[PDB]
Design a binder for these strands. Structure first.
Ligand SMILES: [Mg+2]
Ligand SMILES: [Mg+2]
Lengths: 104, 53, 74, 136, 177
RNA sequence: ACCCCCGUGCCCAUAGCACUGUGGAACCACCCCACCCCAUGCCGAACUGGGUCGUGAAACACAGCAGCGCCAAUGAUACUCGGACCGCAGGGUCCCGGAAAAGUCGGUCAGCGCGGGGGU
RNA sequence: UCCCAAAAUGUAACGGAGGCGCCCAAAGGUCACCUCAAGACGGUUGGAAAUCGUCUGUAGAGCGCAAAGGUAGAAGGUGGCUUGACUGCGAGACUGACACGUCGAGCAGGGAGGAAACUCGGGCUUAGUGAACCGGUGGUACCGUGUGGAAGGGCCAUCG
């Protein structure tokens, strides 16, 4: 049950990668799209759909992902390595990926 | 690496035009007929490659 | 029976404190006793090796999971 | 006496006493004072003999089961490997190991049973009394 | 069809007899697993379709032929061979079969007297000891192969047996008084 | 600044289980629906899409509790590097250092970071 | 493969035990998903085990075979797609008296799976094999004793 999230954490190499990693918490209706450093346990841009949602808790799946990439432009990020938990990369979570891969 | 009538055998490799061997230890035990694959020989690559002698 | 036997080998090759090089073999083992740390790769036969230059570093978190990292000098 | 199932062979080594205690499962006890090998047959020797001196009771404990197989010479020669798998079982015993212990009976009734079951043994022994309280 | 009486004749009747502080803590019905005894003593490749079809017409769902546990004892046991069957009903299809069991199944049974009242699973669940299959509204001996038995298991979300027995009887379950 | 919640690290049982209490719409979970994108060799349990009420029961978080786990002295002892001896022998002793295990005292059911959110 | 082996490695005996001379188009690569043995309680051809359900459960299972190590974030179990069980190479190391054997990042020509980072040059590893000579087959064209061919010979692979 907790195996799905770890299978993508041990999988996504941290150090040897050199890259960063983007997490995602969409088991509910509250995506964070938090971005985390490979060595340092800090956070850079950190997106979330908490500050308003305009009555949308499902459709903003792509709005937050566009907001993220744009929010990352102010830091200097080129490469992002995604790290979903128990998410088979379907729809709600796919919108983030797509939106933060062309909006960057 | 014994070699008798027993099941499984050492296989020569051919190709569409290509003239190259892969040397593979097959076996007549289960599905024993479709010994076809895709091993690019020195060449453009992507050649139909069946070890089936 | 007297018959049967095997020379065998295994063990550790690069100990901690030592200065490795890109390709030096660190520890040989059968299973996964020493897990590949930072700077250290792992062969089919769980044979640990080094990717670049640096220093041998052992890490132990209460047995079970061993780790070996390489701290570059420069 | 003999084990019900084991590996078969063994080796040989004598260190100091480890798991031997002054008193348990009774009041009086008998302790060795010399390292040696106590044969299975020797244990039968002691047990039977103490049962002759004790008509009823059955309060005779023997917690030194032999767990040590020994080899033996079948005939002659030396052109061979493990010789004599089945010979006898011996239980190792180190000074301060309790072999025997009795209870219910008096003082005199105990000085006889240990005495007697002392002459059979390859080593010296002494009989003790209570005043030990280590673990329980 | 059902569900309406599943609540009114249950939930409100529970806070008026016990004392729930929540409509969520109210004992519910999770699933009804059906097991099929096949093979072993009766190793027949024909008997497999006998149950495979019938089970798929009585509960309206394709069952799964659970093989052996890879255990080879002294008697007739093999490594990995279809011997068991699993028919888990939950949700819509659950109440569909359940209702049929309380209205037609149990009532329409020869020498029927009821079911053992003693508390069965002591974890808040319950189990049924169904046997003969010639007592179902879907099973027609005039168009089958042979005659066999089936096992039904009632899986609920009760905490205790006291709250389980209540739920079962109120929903529709006869007992031998 | 105060506190709390959520996400994610270091640490990876002296930070674990059990028992008990607290938390109700900021957050979390259950729950409701789910013909279709997707999916459980059967079941939308779990994945999953669209979202009210209700509830906090369960889960989770926190707090007390330490009966149980875990961690674990001091002293002494086993053993041993070194030196020096005894018995016919299985063995054993003295001097000088290092120094267990177990058990006991006792210790504590963490601490230390980053980001975001909602409250005073 | 363990033990002897006396806490690096190594170390003998007609010392103590148990295996191998294979297997697999998948048990491969990769990509996703599932988590065990057993006991207790209650249930129908059962009545020991087993089929089902619910709890306990650092796994006391499993990993094709012998054993040890190791594995719960899997080297446990399934499914989709594939033929990297590829070719031309290999800094630097382990190991041996030599000969062999073992691990390997990276680079190149081309492919596989995934959105992707990334991984893959056989299978959890350690046995499942053996020099040279001689010969068979395919390939490629270097030699070919006057020249141009050919026989033959070499080389690449591979078989006995
Ligand atoms: Mg040694
Ligand atoms: Mg010759």
């Amino acid at each position: 049950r907790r195996k799905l999230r770890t299978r993508r954490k041990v999988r996504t190499t941290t150090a040897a990668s050199g890259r960063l990693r983007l997490s995602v918490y969409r088991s509910s209706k509250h995506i964070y799209a938090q971005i985390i450093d490979d060595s340092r346990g800090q956070t850079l841009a950190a997106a979330s759909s908490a500050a308003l949602k305009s009555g949308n808790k499902t459709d903003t799946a792509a709005a937050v992902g566009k907001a993220l990439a744009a929010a990352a432009a102010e830091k200097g990020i080129k490469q992002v390595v995604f790290d979903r938990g128990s998410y088979k990369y379907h729809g709600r979570v796919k919108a983030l990926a797509d939106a933060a891969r062309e909006g960057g | 690496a014994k070699d008798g009538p027993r099941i499984i055998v050492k296989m020569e490799s051919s190709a569409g035009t290509g003239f190259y061997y892969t040397t593979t230890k097959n076996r007549r035990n289960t599905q024993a007929k479709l010994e076809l694959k895709k091993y690019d020989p020195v060449a453009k690559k992507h050649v139909v490659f069946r070890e089936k002698k | 029976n007297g018959r049967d036997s095997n020379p065998k080998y295994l063990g550790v090759k690069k100990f901690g404190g030592e200065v490795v090089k890109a390709g030096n073999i660190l520890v040989r083992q059968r299973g996964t006793k020493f897990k590949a740390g930072q700077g250290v790769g792992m062969g089919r036969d769980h044979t640990l090796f080094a990717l670049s230059d640096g220093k041998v570093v052992f890490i132990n978190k209460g047995k079970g999971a061993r780790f070996i990292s390489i701290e570059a000098a420069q | 006496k003999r084990t019900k199932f084991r590996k078969q062979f063994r080796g040989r080594m004598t260190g100091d006493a480890k798991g031997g205690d002054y008193v348990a499962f009774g009041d009086y006890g008998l302790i060795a004072m010399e390292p040696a090998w106590i044969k299975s047959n020797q244990i039968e020797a002691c047990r039977i003999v103490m049962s002759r001196h004790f008509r009823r009771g059955g309060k005779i404990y023997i917690r030194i089961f032999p767990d040590k197989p020994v080899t033996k010479k079948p005939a002659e020669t030396r052109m061979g490997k493990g010789k004599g798998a089945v010979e006898y079982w011996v239980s190792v015993v180190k000074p301060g190991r309790v072999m025997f212990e009795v209870a219910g009976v008096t003082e005199e009734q105990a000085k006889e049973a240990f005495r007697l079951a002392g002459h059979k043994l390859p080593i010296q022994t002494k009989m003790v009394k209570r005043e030990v309280y280590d673990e329980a | 069809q059902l569900k309406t009486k599943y609540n009114d004749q249950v939930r409100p009747a529970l806070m008026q007899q016990f004392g729930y502080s929540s409509v969520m803590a109210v004992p519910r019905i999770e699933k009804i697993v059906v097991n099929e005894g096949l093979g072993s003593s009766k190793e027949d490749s024909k008997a497999i379709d006998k149950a495979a079809k019938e089970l798929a017409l009585i509960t309206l769902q394709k069952p799964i032929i659970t093989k052996a546990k890879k255990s080879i004892s002294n008697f007739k046991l093999r490594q990995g061979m279809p011997v068991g069957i699993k028919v888990t009903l939950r949700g819509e299809r659950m109440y569909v079969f359940l209702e049929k069991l309380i209205n037609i199944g149990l009532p329409r049974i020869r020498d029927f007297r009821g079911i053992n009242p003693n508390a069965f699973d002591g974890r808040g669940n319950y189990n049924l000891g169904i046997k003969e299959q010639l007592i179902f509204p879907e099973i027609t001996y005039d168009m089958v192969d042979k005659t066999r038995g089936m096992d039904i298991t009632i899986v609920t979300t009760a905490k205790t047996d006291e709250e389980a027995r209540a739920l079962l009887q109120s929903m529709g379950l006869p007992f031998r008084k």
